[PDB]
A paper describes a structure:
The mature HIV-1 capsid is composed of the capsid (CA) protein arranged in a conical lattice of hexamers and pentamers. CA assembles into a conical lattice formed by roughly 200 CA hexamers and exactly twelve CA pentamers, the latter of which facilitate lattice curvature and closure around the viral genome. Monomeric CA consists of two folded domains connected by a flexible linker: The N-terminal domain (NTD) faces the outer surface of the capsid, where it stabilizes the hexamer, while the C-terminal domain (CTD) forms dimeric interactions that link hexamers together. Here, we present cryoelectron microscopy structures of continuous regions of the capsid lattice containing both hexamers and pentamers.
Finally, we extended our lattice templating approach to understanding the interaction of the capsid-targeting antiretroviral compound GS-6207 (lenacapavir; marketed by Gilead Sciences as Sunlenca®) with CA. We determined the structure of this compound bound to SUV-templated CA lattice at an estimated resolution of 3.1 Å. Consistent with crystal structures of cross-linked CA hexamers bound to GS-6207 (45, 46), we found that the compound binds to the ‘FG binding pocket’ between the NTD and CTD of adjacent hexamer monomers. Importantly, this site is also targeted by FG motif-containing host cell proteins CPSF6, Nup153, and Sec24C. GS-6207 density was completely absent from the pentamer, indicating that the compound binds exclusively to hexamers. This selectivity appears to arise from spatial constraints imposed by subtle conformational differences between pentameric and hexameric CA as the FG binding pocket is altered in the pentamer by a structural “switch” between NTD ɑ-helices 3 and 4. We attribute this selective binding to a structural “switch” in the CA NTD that promotes a conformational change in CA monomers and drives oligomerization to either the pentameric or the hexameric state (40 and 35). This conformational change reshapes the FG binding pocket in pentamers, resulting in a steric block of GS-6207 access to the site. Work described in the accompanying manuscript demonstrates how this remodeling also prevents binding of FG motif-containing host cell proteins CPSF6, Nup153, and Sec24C to pentamers.
Residue numbers in the entry:
A (entry chain A), B (entry chain D): 12 to 85, 96 to 220
C (entry chain C), D (entry chain C), E (entry chain C): 1 to 85, 96 to 222
């Protein structure tokens, strides 16, 4: 066991401040927090500047997951608060991690944090994808890039997302690209759509 | 034992000069000062640039905590001044930390510095949590961000902060959103609250 | 009332003068508000029919109220005689006009007890409920929250008028559920309807705190 | 209550009619202010569960308050039965609905005593605290000193609202320390902040005498 | 209190519920005016330390007042222990927190009597005097006769504020002699100074009848 290096905290702060809570911060958090105890995760989340409403969402989600863990699971065994790093201590956490088999309180807490971060990203989505419409001059590549960005941020289910990509993307296109998309018709990959909709 | 590298001091200087004394400075100080002697802590505190009023406040708080330690407590026994590093050597500080059992003079000094930094953070936070109020035209997201930043800088007990989160957020909202928040009622989560108050 | 002798023989204990004075103050000063029935029940605890008649003698100053109290007592006595044809206490004898004190003490001390005092008390309370219903300054449909009135004061007025109204229990439940919301001012009524149906009085009160 | 016989055998002493009338006056006139709980404690000193039920029968006029008083009593009885599985007094029997008088007298006279009356009194006081919390006209955050209001009157209003609020003890301490100063008018608030943190209520009152 | 048995053995007589209710009404309604100390003395006549503690339990609703009442009681108990080093009643045992009832009855019934109840009553009255001093709306120097105020009303306000002030006796004498005249309005003040020094309150009142 080694204490969290400063450079990881600097990287976490930098990515959070530069990317906001965009969908790409989840993998960055997951990679930075590799092998991190609940104390380290708490320090990482405390270093975040701004976005304190989002941090409140995250800790509310952690509370919900801790309550669910306590409901499902009625040395000392770890409870939801212990896994969250509130009532437990560093020695207990690292002991649980080093037990054979390991009791990875860090990984479970990281899963809870990832769920809360996904909720944060969905809430921080600037606009609903129903309002993402191609302008009368915007290129199809730019419009569709924005569309799939909003779709990734919205985190809709796969079955719904298939319908959205199939129909809504075509329906929201501007009249010229709209006509070319009808001419292409269904069953066409996005490769065909964008290579045919050029200019 | 190893003397602190210049990278740690450069990181401390960078975070202080960039973020000022925001609540996120506390975890950064805690992470940077891991396993640090009082001499290392004094060097880290000396490397700071401006905010000399804040540094004087930290000195005063450390003096108060040293007086309290001397009152509590009637190789050589470490006193408050010895903990502060004014009347102690690096060798004596390596002592009491390599001692069997150890009395971690470094951790106590870090705790006093953390108390002083909490006081400085509250001083640098301009407005009181009771005074944080939603503007008539302000978005609820911005208002909640300001509210939770101020609350994190508020420096009160945890139960008190829980009560503040429960009550003051609804109490201080503008009349346009306060009626919606009352209709939601107690028990509504923050995600529900800021989805409802999106308009 | 009735108390035990040193030898255990139950004997009369007349209602004290200041208890009667308290009853007189209730009758004269309260103007037959709903609270006179709780106060009549309190001041006449374990009272014999003779004690109840002594209490009614002070109500006797009010001619109309006394006359309909007497008429309701007579109706209830007739109903008791119809349904219930020392000796068995006759319905007229429950009122104490005919019976003597020792018969009443014997009936209340019987094994099992014959609570004649409680029965006459219930008849008197029925008559007082009628009188209270008459003297209500306004009907429940007329209670309305003002623009400035706090929801607590309006709720108190509404529930006092509901006590005076004395409708059926299901009707009262509907009234508290719907008419309470209907008569609130628009500022409170918005939150009242936002809470939706089924809200208890506690939620309704807490949500409307300081809205006025 | 319970009193000694001439031979030392403990016997019932029913709550007097005027004590019940005082309780009825408290319930009807005070509109469930915080002071009803001290007054309920005073008027029901050394009272058996039967006496407490007699007192609650007068509260019964208020439908909502009685219903949640009953629900809180039931919850506390269930908790007592869970934690505590003549005979041992069952939690439902502490309420007196099932038990008879002699069992209650025996339990309160036991060596060591089984204060069933005090337990039922505590449950009733919990329910009355809930009712008092509901009926508060304003929240503690809404109490504000006016430009003319003396600091004494404002402090009295603040502390009465604090009693109605019934937050945690640490929360109450923070409230009295900080929110009391925050809500004072600027003329007093200047002196309040000049005194600095840690000032007791005595210093705060003396320094702000006649400032308005 | 304490009463004689039929056989002459002194036994406890608990403070009645309505006396406690009267004390609660005094505490809640009067807002700690000077009159609470006479009323506390009246309602606690011949009271044991247990009875005094029962009375203080109702004051306990007011957090600050209870806390400084307790602190003054502790200070007086410490002073008693310092000056006074069954057994001899310890100063902490005068408060009744440690002692039991029979010890208190024995001490109050001793030959010569050990008035422990009166001593604890004096300590409580000292604490209540402190609380009364705090809650005074204005200082004695701020009491002033208005242009229309009769001299009788102004004198009553002045003397009530003097009771709340609780300065030294010589200081109080000087205040009544000089400050009472100084604060009167010019119409009355002319006659007040014309009477000259040494005028008793009777002459001062009679001469200023109807002057306003």
């Amino acid at each position: 066991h080694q204490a969290i290096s400063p450079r990881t905290l600097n990287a976490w702060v930098k990515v959070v401040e530069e990317k906001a809570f965009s969908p790409e911060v989840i993998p960055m958090f997951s990679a930075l927090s590799e092998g991190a105890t609940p104390q380290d995760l708490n320090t990482m989340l405390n270093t975040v500047g701004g976005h304190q409403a989002a941090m409140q969402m995250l800790k509310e989600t952690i509370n919900e997951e801790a309550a669910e863990w306590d409901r499902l699971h009625p040395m000392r065994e770890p409870r939801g608060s212990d896994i969250a790093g509130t009532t437990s201590t560093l020695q207990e956490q690292i002991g649980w991690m080093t037990h054979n088999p390991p009791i990875p309180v860090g990984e479970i807490y990281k899963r809870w944090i990832i769920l809360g971060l996904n909720k944060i990203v969905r809430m921080y989505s600037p606009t609903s994808i129903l309002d993402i419409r191609q302008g009368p001059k915007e290129p199809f590549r730019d419009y569709v890039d924005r569309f799939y960005k909003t779709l990734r941020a919205e985190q809709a289910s796969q079955e719904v997302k298939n319908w959205m990509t199939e129909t809504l993307l075509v329906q929201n296109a501007n009249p010229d690209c709209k006509t070319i998309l009808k001419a292409l018709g269904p069953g066409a990959t996005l490769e065909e759509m964008m290579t045919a909709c050029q200019g």
